[PDB]
Symmetry: C2
Subunit: 185 residues, 2 copies
C-alpha cells in the first residue's frame, strides 16, 4: 500500500524535525528565556515534578529570571535543583522569590555556538534527506516486486519531494531564527 | 542537559533507526516461503477484526509454498480476501480447511535489483546511526562550550556512546547479511 508508505515519510520527517527543535531549544543565547528551566525536575510532594507546576517563572530583564514559589517549603528544593543542573545561574532569594542571573556569554563561546548550531542544522538536513532516500528505496522495492507501476513511483516521488521541501523550509527557518538570537545583543 | 539524558537519547534514537530498517527489509520478497510475511495480516470476520494467526496456523510446506490451516472453514473467504488485499503477490488455491499460498517466483534480474536495493536501504540505516552519533556529540560539545560539563565529562560520554553505536551497527549489519543470504538462497 502506497498510502501506508506516504505517511511514514511525513511521520519520520516531522518526528525528526521535532527532535532537532527540542535539542536546539535549550541552547543558551545570552538573553534570558523561561524555557531554559523547562525540564528542571524538583523533588517535592512525594516525587518529582516539573518546575513550572510548583512555581511561576518570568523574565525580569535581559539577564534575569524571577521564580515565584507558591509553597515556601519548596524554596530550598528548587534552589538545590537549579544549582545541581550545573547551568551556573547566579541564585539568590527574597521571601518567596528566587532570582536567577544569566551568566555572560563570551565572544569565543558565542562563535563556538554559532558553529555548533550550524553543524546540528546539517545533522537535521541529513536525517530529512536520508528519510526521503529510504522512502523512495522502499517504493523502488514495491515497483521492482511488481506491486506498483512506474507511474505510481514517479507520482508519489513528486508528492514526497514536495513534502520534503516544505519540511526543510521549516528546518532552515528554525535554525536561522536561533542563529539570529545568538548573533544579536 | 544532563549527560545521562543525552546518552539515553542516543540509545533511543538509534534503536528507532534500527527498528525502522528491520521493517523496511521485511518487505523485501526473497523468492522463498517465510511465515513472517503474514504476521501483520488482519482479517475481517465474525463482525470484527482478528489477527490471522488467531483463526489459523501458518506453516511452510516447501520452498515456494505456505500452508494455512483455517480451523473455522467458514473463515476461508475472509482470510483469502485479507491476504490478497495486502498485495503480497501470492498464488492462492483452496482445499477443505486449507489455503495453499505459492510464493511469486523471482527472476534473476529482480533478485539482482533487490540485492542492490537492500544494500542501499542498509546504508541509509548506517547513515542515520552515524548522523545521530554526530548530532549527540554536537549536543555534548554545546554543553561543554556552555560550561555545563567538563572536557573529561564529554570524552567519557563519547566513549560510552561509541559503544552504543558499535552495538547497534553490529545488529544492522547482521540483519543485512542474513537478509542477503535469504535473497541468494
Ligand atoms: Cl552570574
Ligand atoms: Cl567556549
Ligand atoms: Cl529514521
Ligand atoms: Cl564536535
Amino acid at each position: 500500500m502506497i498510502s501506508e508508505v506516504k505517511q511514514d515519510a511525513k511521520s519520520r520527517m516531522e518526528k525528526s524535525l521535532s527532535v532537532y527543535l527540542s535539542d536546539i531549544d535549550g541552547i543558551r543565547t545570552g538573553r534570558a528565556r523561561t524555557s531554559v528551566l523547562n525540564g528542571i525536575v524538583v523533588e517535592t510532594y512525594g516525587g518529582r515534578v516539573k518546575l513550572n507546576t510548583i512555581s511561576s517563572v518570568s523574565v525580569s530583564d535581559n539577564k534575569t529570571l524571577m521564580i515565584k514559589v507558591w509553597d515556601s517549603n519548596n524554596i530550598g528544593a528548587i534552589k538545590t535543583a537549579i544549582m545541581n543542573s550545573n547551568l551556573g545561574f547566579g541564585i539568590s532569594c527574597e521571601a518567596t522569590t528566587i532570582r536567577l542571573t544569566v551568566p555572560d556569554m563570551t565572544q569565543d563561546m558565542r562563535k563556538n555556538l554559532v558553529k555548533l548550531l550550524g553543524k546540528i542544522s546539517e545533522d537535521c538536513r541529513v536525517s530529512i534527506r536520508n528519510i526521503r532516500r529510504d522512502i523512495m528505496d522502499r517504493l523502488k522495492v514495491m515497483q521492482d516486486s511488481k506491486e506498483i507501476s512506474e507511474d505510481d513511483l514517479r507520482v508519489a516521488g513528486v508528492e514526497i519531494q514536495k513534502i520534503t521541501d516544505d519540511i526543510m523550509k521549516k528546518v532552515n527557518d528554525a535554525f536561522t531564527s536561533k542563529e539570529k538570537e545568538l548573533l544579536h545583543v
